[PDB]
Write a protein that binds this ligand. Sequence first.
Ligand SMILES: OC[C@H]1O[C@H](O[C@H]2[C@H](O)[C@@H](O)[C@H](O)O[C@@H]2CO)[C@H](O)[C@@H](O)[C@@H]1O
Length: 190
Amino acid sequence: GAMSGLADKVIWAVNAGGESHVDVHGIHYRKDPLEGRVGRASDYGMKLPILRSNPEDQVLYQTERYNEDSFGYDIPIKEEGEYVLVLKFAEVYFAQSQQKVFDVRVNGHTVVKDLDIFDRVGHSTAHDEIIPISIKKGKLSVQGEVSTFTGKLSVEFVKGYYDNPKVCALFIMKGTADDVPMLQPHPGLE
Ligand SMILES: OC[C@H]1O[C@H](O[C@H]2[C@H](O)[C@@H](O)[C@H](O)O[C@@H]2CO)[C@H](O)[C@@H](O)[C@@H]1O
């Protein structure tokens, strides 16, 4: 009973910062599909790397473009099973705990409404949010709230004080939460 295949189950993945990235397992981001729709890469603070990732996956877990007020993405689906939405949140020059609090939603539903990246991980590094979804017979299930699925899924984040998401590493893959592997490079395995 062996199951290995991350690149064969991905349906939609986006990193808000640079432009198009393929990570070590085979996960690919598009190119600026939320603010402006068609443009280029913007990096205002590129000499501050992430400590819990790789060099290649550091670019997909560190690069940020720009912010405004109340915004998000659209994911179109037509199949049922276990869909997992894992997104990496990161910061640059903001030191505060329990003052810079944000809101995060999936398909209109509220899940993490008090998101502070400095109080959760500490100073800099990589922050991770794991939210498993179950759609069966044409309806959606988010933890302890049941509703119906109609065409697309939405990721809508609301403002805290000055900024909204800051650094975002969106990754939605399909079939189950026991198939998502994440490790660092090591020479000895025992
Ligand atoms: O100009 C690029 C960055 O602009 C803003 O960052 C501000 C920040 O909001 C403010 O508190 C501080 O005093 O100044 C920095 C820039 O000098 C945006 O928030 C960033 O997304 C931009 O990268």
